[PDB]
Scaffold this active site. Structure first.
Site, PDB file in Angstrom:
ATOM      1  N   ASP A  43       3.903  -7.457   4.319  1.00 48.02           N
ATOM      2  CA  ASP A  43       3.900  -5.957   4.913  1.00 48.02           C
ATOM      3  C   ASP A  43       3.676  -6.272   6.200  1.00 48.02           C
ATOM      4  OD1 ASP A  43       1.114  -6.931   4.379  1.00 48.02           O
ATOM      5  OD2 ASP A  43       0.284  -5.264   5.092  1.00 48.02           O
ATOM      6  N   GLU A  55       8.402  -6.130   4.254  1.00 45.50           N
ATOM      7  CA  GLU A  55       8.752  -4.649   5.009  1.00 45.50           C
ATOM      8  C   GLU A  55       8.727  -4.406   6.207  1.00 45.50           C
ATOM      9  OE1 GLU A  55       5.311  -2.514   5.890  1.00 45.50           O
ATOM     10  OE2 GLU A  55       7.025  -2.104   6.918  1.00 45.50           O
TER      11      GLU A  55
END
Length: 621
Positions: free
Chosen positions: A305, A356
């Site tokens: 992330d 991401e």
């Protein structure tokens, strides 16, 4: 003559020691345990544990090259708890083991204390066939449908108690199997003091916890899912670590794991938060940890992330500084990411790395030899924002925002994408997926099926967060289980059965497996006034037509260009009564008319049901 070889020490300090968990940490033998810690600025280090009586003077580790301390303790056994006392000048602090392979039930100090646990990672696997056939390749040309799961809040055994790693294996596997997902993606399992962090802070990168069981309990969970044909992806958090006092912060009396400070009599105090990716020890710590999950826990994927927080150091107006000596980009961090990915695929080809990244960095999923970051997949966040924007608009205004619906195809092929409806979208002030939908209850339900219909037709792999698959009413709450009682209501039962039938179509029809330009072609995007779009998915000699009606107005005699004549058939219809729909559709043979529509040789003439997704295919049997 010691714990460490001269080659161990060369490799540590050059930052090429990618199996450093072999020697760092706590390693039991039949009689005692070796302890090994990185602390290059400490004046002393001792091991405090149940086996002395936490006496900081019982077992003072000796110093080696490269800032490593090591010491043997006879009678230190698996199951003992222990800690490190770090002395730096006149300051002294107790620390948990960065390389802890387990951390005791008290795993905060809100929790009732915190010690690492001496552990052996012994476990006999039964998943050879999964690992062979897991040639989880270029899964690029195969179906990938991810069920995103926070372990603790999925189901609860009796009240506020989660299932364990062992107790969750069978119901999770059953459910994922009936729902037809190929993978489960787990929110961070690495040890974290704050449950409400969802795992994203992280004090124990090598420790799966003790909140759902032991290291071997999670291994059993992964072993069990592998034998039932289900892959496992772990969220992994190299961008920053928890700020807790007993974790990595400071550590040896200085900035060790985090960045070092400039001159600080006022002056824009920029320092720390991320890992210091230019310390060789940090590259050892993190690259070792990625391989550790892949090897000791057989995991199939790692998702990273906040890759944007790693690529840039921006923060503010005025932070590094511009001129002509560098940029906004964290050079060592970009190099770390690229070394990360190229190590993973060397040692574990057909593992998956997933990113991401929220700033439209080019080539997130492109090879490092073309200046890419090296990931297999990138989350299609742009597709998510535009789709949740458009769908949230009341149908009466949707005709004014048609571009929000067709725009994502402009950029759909600039990366290898996962289309994600993640946990981040159903917390804070944002509403569940059901809550985001406009209108009355049946319209909310039909909008969520229409949304899933489009998501599965849109190029990219698929990821959905738990609860979303049956339109749970409320935002995800990590302190409770999901709202499973809603499966007694027909609209939520109906949404769940449609996701299941979408997954099945995805897994049995190759027409959906190629997410590059060859795999998709427009049939019509120009019907702004009625909020309809048509498009083809196309792979190995197989073809599916998607027709999507984004208004609750039924459309009769709606013409749709198709490139193949002959009899067509409806494969899936989201207005079927089984899904909570009203039962409109195009039943039996749908014959293609040899007149021309949409610049196509033939056309179909269809009933479009309200807020419905139609999926049709030519008869080729």
């Amino acid at each position: 003559m010691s714990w460490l070889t001269e080659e161990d020490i060369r490799r540590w300090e050059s930052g090429t020691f990618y199996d450093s968990y072999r020697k760092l940490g706590a390693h039991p033998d039949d009689e005692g345990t070796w302890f090994c810690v990185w602390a290059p600025h400490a004046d002393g280090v001792s091991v405090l544990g149940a086996f002395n009586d936490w006496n900081p003077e019982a077992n003072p580790l000796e110093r080696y090259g490269g800032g490593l301390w090591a010491g043997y303790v006879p009678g230190a056994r698996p199951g003992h708890t222990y800690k490190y006392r770090i002395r730096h000048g006149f300051y002294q602090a107790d620390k948990t083991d960065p390389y802890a392979f387990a951390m005791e039930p008290p795993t905060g100090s809100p929790i009732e204390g915190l010690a690492s646990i001496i552990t052996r990672l012994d476990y006999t696997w039964h998943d050879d066939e999964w690992m062979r056939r897991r040639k989880g390749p270029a899964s690029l040309y195969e179906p990938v449908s991810i069920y995103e799961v926070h372990l603790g809040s999925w189901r609860h055994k009796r009240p506020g108690e989660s299932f364990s790693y062992r107790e969750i294996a069978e119901p999770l596997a059953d459910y994922v199997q009936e729902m037809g997902f190929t993978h489960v993606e787990l929110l961070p399992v690495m040890e974290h003091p704050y449950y409400g962090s969802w795992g994203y802070q992280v004090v124990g990168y090598y420790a799966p916890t003790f909140r759902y069981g032991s290291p071997q309990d999670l291994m059993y969970l992964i072993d069990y899912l592998h034998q039932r044909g289900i892959g496992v992806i772990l969220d992994w958090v190299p961008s920053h670590f928890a700020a807790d006092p007993q974790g990595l912060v400071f550590f040896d009396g200085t900035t060790l794991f985090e960045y070092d400070d400039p001159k600080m009599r006022y002056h824009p105090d920029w320092g720390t938060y991320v890992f210091d990716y230019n310390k060789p020890g940090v590259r050892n710590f993190l690259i070792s940890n990625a391989l550790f999950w892949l090897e000791k826990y057989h995991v199939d994927g790692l998702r990273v992330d906040a890759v944007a927080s790693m690529l840039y150091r921006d923060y503010s107006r005025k932070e590094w500084t511009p001129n002509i000596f560098g940029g906004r980009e964290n050079l060592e961090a970009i190099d770390f990411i690229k070394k990360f990915n190229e190590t993973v695929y060397l040692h574990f080809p057909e593992a998956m790395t997933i990113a991401e990244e929220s700033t439209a960095w080019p080539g997130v999923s492109a090879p490092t030899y073309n200046n890419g970051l090296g990931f297999l997949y990138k989350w299609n966040m742009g597709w998510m924002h535009d789709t949740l924007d458009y769908i949230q608009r009341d149908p009466i205004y949707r005709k004014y925002h048609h571009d929000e619906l067709t725009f994502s195809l402009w950029y759909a092929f600039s990366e290898h994408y996962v289309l994600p409806l993640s946990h981040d979208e159903v917390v804070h002030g944002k509403g569940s997926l059901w809550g985001k939908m406009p209108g009355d209850d049946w319209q909310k339900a039909a909008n969520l099926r229409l949304l899933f219909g489009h998501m599965w037709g849109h190029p990219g792999k698929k990821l959905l967060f738990m609860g979303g698959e049956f339109g749970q009413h409320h935002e995800w709450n990590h302190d409770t289980q999901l709202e499973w009682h809603l499966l007694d209501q027909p609209y939520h039962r109906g949404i769940q059965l449609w996701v299941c039938d979408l997954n099945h179509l995805y897994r049995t029809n190759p027409a959906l497996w190629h997410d590059g330009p060859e795999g998709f072609e427009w049939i019509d995007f120009s019907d702004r006034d009625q909020s309809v779009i048509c498009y083809l998915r196309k792979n190995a000699g197989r073809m599916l037509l998607f027709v999507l009606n984004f208004t609750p107005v039924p459309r009769e005699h709606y013409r749709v260009g198709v490139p193949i004549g002959g009899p067509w058939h409806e494969v899936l219809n989201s207005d079927a009564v089984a899904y909570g729909g009203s039962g409109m559709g195009n039943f039996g043979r749908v014959e293609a008319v040899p007149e021309s529509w949409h610049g196509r040789p033939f056309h179909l003439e269809l009933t479009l049901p309200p807020l419905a997704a139609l999926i049709l295919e030519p008869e080729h049997g």
